[PDB]
Amino acid sequence: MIIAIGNDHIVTMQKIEISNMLKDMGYTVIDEGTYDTHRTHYPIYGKKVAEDVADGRADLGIVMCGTGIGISTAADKNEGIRAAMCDDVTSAVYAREQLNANVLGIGGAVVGVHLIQDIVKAYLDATYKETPENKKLIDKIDNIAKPNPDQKDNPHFFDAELEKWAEGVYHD
Amino acid sequence: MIIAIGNDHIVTMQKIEISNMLKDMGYTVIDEGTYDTHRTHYPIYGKKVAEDVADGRADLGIVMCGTGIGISTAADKNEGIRAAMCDDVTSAVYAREQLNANVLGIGGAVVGVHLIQDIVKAYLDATYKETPENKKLIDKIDNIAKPNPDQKDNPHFFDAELEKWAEGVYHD
Amino acid sequence: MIIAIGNDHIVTMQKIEISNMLKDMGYTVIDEGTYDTHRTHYPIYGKKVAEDVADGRADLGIVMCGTGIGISTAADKNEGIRAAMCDDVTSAVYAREQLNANVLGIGGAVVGVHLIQDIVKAYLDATYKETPENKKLIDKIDNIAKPNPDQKDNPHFFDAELEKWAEGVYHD
Amino acid sequence: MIIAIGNDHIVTMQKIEISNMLKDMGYTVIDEGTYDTHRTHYPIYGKKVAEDVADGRADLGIVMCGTGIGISTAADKNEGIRAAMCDDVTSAVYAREQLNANVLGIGGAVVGVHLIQDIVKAYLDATYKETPENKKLIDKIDNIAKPNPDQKDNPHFFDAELEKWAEGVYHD
Amino acid sequence: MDVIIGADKDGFAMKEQVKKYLEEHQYRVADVTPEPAEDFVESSLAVTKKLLNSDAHKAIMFDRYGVGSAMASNKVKGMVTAVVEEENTAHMTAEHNGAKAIAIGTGITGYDRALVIIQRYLDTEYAGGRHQIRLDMLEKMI
Amino acid sequence: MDVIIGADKDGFAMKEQVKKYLEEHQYRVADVTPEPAEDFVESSLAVTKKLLNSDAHKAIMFDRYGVGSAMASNKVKGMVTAVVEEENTAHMTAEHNGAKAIAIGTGITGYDRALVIIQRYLDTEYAGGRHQIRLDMLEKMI
Amino acid sequence: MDVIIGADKDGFAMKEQVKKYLEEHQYRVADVTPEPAEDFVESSLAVTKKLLNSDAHKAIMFDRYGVGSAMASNKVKGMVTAVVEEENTAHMTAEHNGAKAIAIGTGITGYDRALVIIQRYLDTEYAGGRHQIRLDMLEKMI
Amino acid sequence: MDVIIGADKDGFAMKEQVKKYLEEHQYRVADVTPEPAEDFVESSLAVTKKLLNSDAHKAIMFDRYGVGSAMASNKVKGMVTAVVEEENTAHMTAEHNGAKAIAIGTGITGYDRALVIIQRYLDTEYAGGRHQIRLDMLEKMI
């Protein structure tokens, strides 16, 4: 099985821990998230991971940022993706069993590594079990957003923002 | 104000982060917990922290181990101590305000650093608000254990167990 | 200017530090080396970095492993590359100025981060100063190896060794 | 055998690595150096380690700071101490065999952990071998400084400086 | 300060309690689900619509796990919903993500904790500045 | 398997729900607080006394924040009580600390999460080995 | 044991000192540069050729900065040359990389340190095992 | 800029070379050891005395390992001597420690590297500021 993983600079070390664990468990990992700890932006990596899963390059995805909120939301805003923001094992298992979530988001700065490992393990170990009820929910979720071909598979989608950042437009 | 802090080898890095924060906040810190990451035993540092607080060398204590259970339990098992095991801000504030807890315990391996910082600040910012109700609770709590003069301020208290450990009595 | 960087699992943390520095300095970075700390093989990333530089995707390369010997040797064994193994500022400057080295190798486990930063900056600040003398040396160096079209730009080049590793052929 | 170790905030992580190694090797460690990474001053810990060795509380001492220069110099400026600043195995062995150095200083930010381990190991493994020549050198060294009882065993020796620091006298 | 609230069958109970709490604290509350919604998709989308059409910048969604309301509501272009189960994210998501709403799982978070989470979220303002680039990126997505 | 349970006024509701859960799952339960205890001090010590005086090795205490029952029961020589709010400590405290009981705060932890926590705690045995030195140290304290 | 040595004009002096050292220590030395080589390219390739064509498994190349001899000799298929300036790589490169030769820069490393480096390299054998996958990869390259 | 230099028998050779280098670069050099000193204690203390009595703030001591000149000279109240064998400490010790002198081990550091070390040391000024507290502490010691 192939797992795509991504992250922002705040939790690169937590990403590395999960990457090592996944490989030890026998998974093939596609590391997309930022590779160092230089200030960057969570949507870039959330989108990369999402497209890997959506295009079939990966079976599931895992994304993290300080709280996980930013990167998991970015991941969710993509065709074919159902991203679940879970800082606990209980909602993570639910996400997989009931919503067939294909991307898991975790807050690397709010959840301790031991618990992050547990969440990831529980999520992966869980299996989606279709029911008339959750099938209806999943259908609704998959049809809320309006597809935008300009965003789909376009890695330059955030270039306008990246340029403005370079020009100092987003100063504090 | 003086804060005594302790930990086992599993969460020394998290202890360092909290120690740094306390100092930046203006607190005087007495670091008792283990200083490196060599396998050791949480009860040792839990007892050390508990006694600093009980004898007035420190005003409050903070202890951490992987889950925090071990070291916080050790801390609680000391005269004059009311140790609160809290991996969340809500119960930590309650612990201080209602039970006048003087030792905070946290699971350094299950709670992320950003949240650990929040729990600590919230616990320190909180103030005990006495009432006839909580005073009765506290008084009951302070009278549950049967004091042992052989434990109180005895640095050699665990020498027996440490020797066995050296002799390999506690092998896996 | 584009700098390609690579590393093995032993020095990923040091690679991250250098990657951060390069970006703060305004360099564009292509991180090829391993992204986590899972046991892997230095020749893989050394070859990746060497090819980015040789094909013009990057202007210069930096590779690191525990001692730097392994990965820098791998990098040197590629067409168009002149890899300089330097754990000191003096020979790094010489490497750039006299031998026009396009790939710098450093021992991430034997050189401290502050010194690694110094070696990198010194190597990048240096400029090749051509002379009839060093041109003859360089020309000789560029003509020692016998090119292999089967290695050049072949991403599956080590697939044979990786399969054996998977089968446990390389056990301890 | 007992080893006293100390450090400033810049290399606390390197200190921790050496502390773990010493204990694994069977040494008893007395950690004096700073326990966290909050900005502090190398002379405080260099002096603590020096007095442990001078007073017999420890057999040998090891101190580190970014370059090792500050803390090793502070350690040397104490009665009964012969501190050797060694970022290499060769001069470290010489320090022990010829000068009977009882305190080893290393630059934690300039020397890689693997080499730091080697230096420490080589230093400890070496044995002083008296000769008419080095006995004369050691005698000269031991009689250069003028003893100051106000400094000897006075832990409050730097209080005047610490107060001025608190008052902002040493602003940048 | 206005606050939009909504819930499905599982989150209704807590939603009713929080509503009472909010009113007691002078908050102008706009409840989009006087009766529990059919499911978390309906309740979450109802809160989103009311929020994105109102001048309010705070909302709370209630369901069994929170996960669902956020997953569904985040599909809406321009919407940013944060599942919250601890007190750090409670304020950080508002500060950095300007989270337009937070989702609470009644089966995950106890009432006393939910209130601390809620009050921290409400008391925190979006910091803007460097954070705006990430928000511009998110609002750009489907 | 045997399980000792108890609760004060705040944790009574969840305690009753869990008892029914445990009964449905073939667990032999010993409820020491058929009627809510006066406070968490009485409920925790009741559970502890019944536990230390029985062949059972697992117990669940229910109160509002968990902290209280743990702080109180841990004062009893030989007792080890773990407050549990998440799924990792749920099993690690049993494996490492051989926790004799776990404390759940109904105002902190939702019912669904509480059940996962409880089931993980019940399915986990003490590992012993190197860990015994720490339990020997704890049981030696007051 | 056998040891192959060589040097260019810059490393000749130290090479001569080391040869005498090695001879005094019962080492059988093969000096391929009785007279200084034209440059480090000629000296390194001479050592390499004599090494890859002999039953010896250790060699020392001497030049001004070490870098050159390593950069040049490493271009030869199957050869592995390690520049060495400190005592840890001195043994690790042999243990892990089974370094066929080490390169010492006389303008970088003092004589006393060079001897410690050399002795550590000579007393260390290749560990093989997991490390072979990397040597197999290197020998496969040009 | 003035520079005080000194050396014992083992460091004399390099000291002579560095002297020539310094003169070629317009440095006013004060050599306290025209003839090698009896040992590194004599040479290091001679440099220290000349330095602490002169208005110069740069000095270089030479011996076999450097370690000795620093160990001995640092016993002098007010003196701060740094053994240097790499290019980062070369400047950092001046910036942070205001190192009054640096010691170079001729048996440890090659000539070309020593020169880079020396020039970096000479080109760097003490930063003062927060660093002064540590210097005040050192000058206070015996």
Numbering used by the authors:
A (entry chain B), B (entry chain D), C (entry chain D), D (entry chain B): 1 to 172
E (entry chain A), F (entry chain C), G (entry chain C), H (entry chain A): 1 to 142
Please give me the paper's original passages concerning this structure.
D-Galactose-6-phosphate isomerase from Lactobacillus rhamnosus (LacAB; EC 5.3.1.26), which is encoded by the tagatose-6-phosphate pathway gene cluster (lacABCD), catalyzes the isomerization of D-galactose-6-phosphate to D-tagatose-6-phosphate during lactose catabolism and is used to produce rare sugars as low-calorie natural sweeteners. The crystal structures of LacAB and its complex with D-tagatose-6-phosphate revealed that LacAB is a homotetramer of LacA and LacB subunits, with a structure similar to that of ribose-5-phosphate isomerase (Rpi). Structurally, LacAB belongs to the RpiB/LacAB superfamily, having a Rossmann-like αβα sandwich fold as has been identified in pentose phosphate isomerase and hexose phosphate isomerase. One active site is distinctly located at the interface between LacA and LacB, whereas two active sites are present in RpiB.
The LacAB interface has a total buried surface area of 2069 Å2 in LacA and 1895 Å2 in LacB, representing 21% of the total surface area of LacA and 28% of the total surface area of LacB, respectively. The interactions between the C-terminal α-helix (α7) of LacB and the antiparallel α-helix (α6) of LacA create a stronger dimer than that established by the RpiB structure. The four residues Ile-133, Met-137, Leu-138, and Met 141 of α6 in LacA form hydrophobic interactions with Tyr-170, Trp-165, Leu-162, Phe-158, and Phe-157 of α7 and Tyr-42, Pro-43, and Ile-44 of α2 in LacB. The Superpose program of the CCP4 suite did not demonstrate any structural differences in conformation between substrate-free LacAB and its complex with Tag6P; the root mean square deviation was 0.12 Å for all Cα atoms. The other vacant and shallow site corresponding to the RpiB was consisted of entirely different residues from the active site, and occupied by hydrophobic residues Phe-40 (LacA), Leu-99 and Leu-137 (LacB) plus bulky residues Tyr-65 (LacA) and Tyr-94 (LacB).
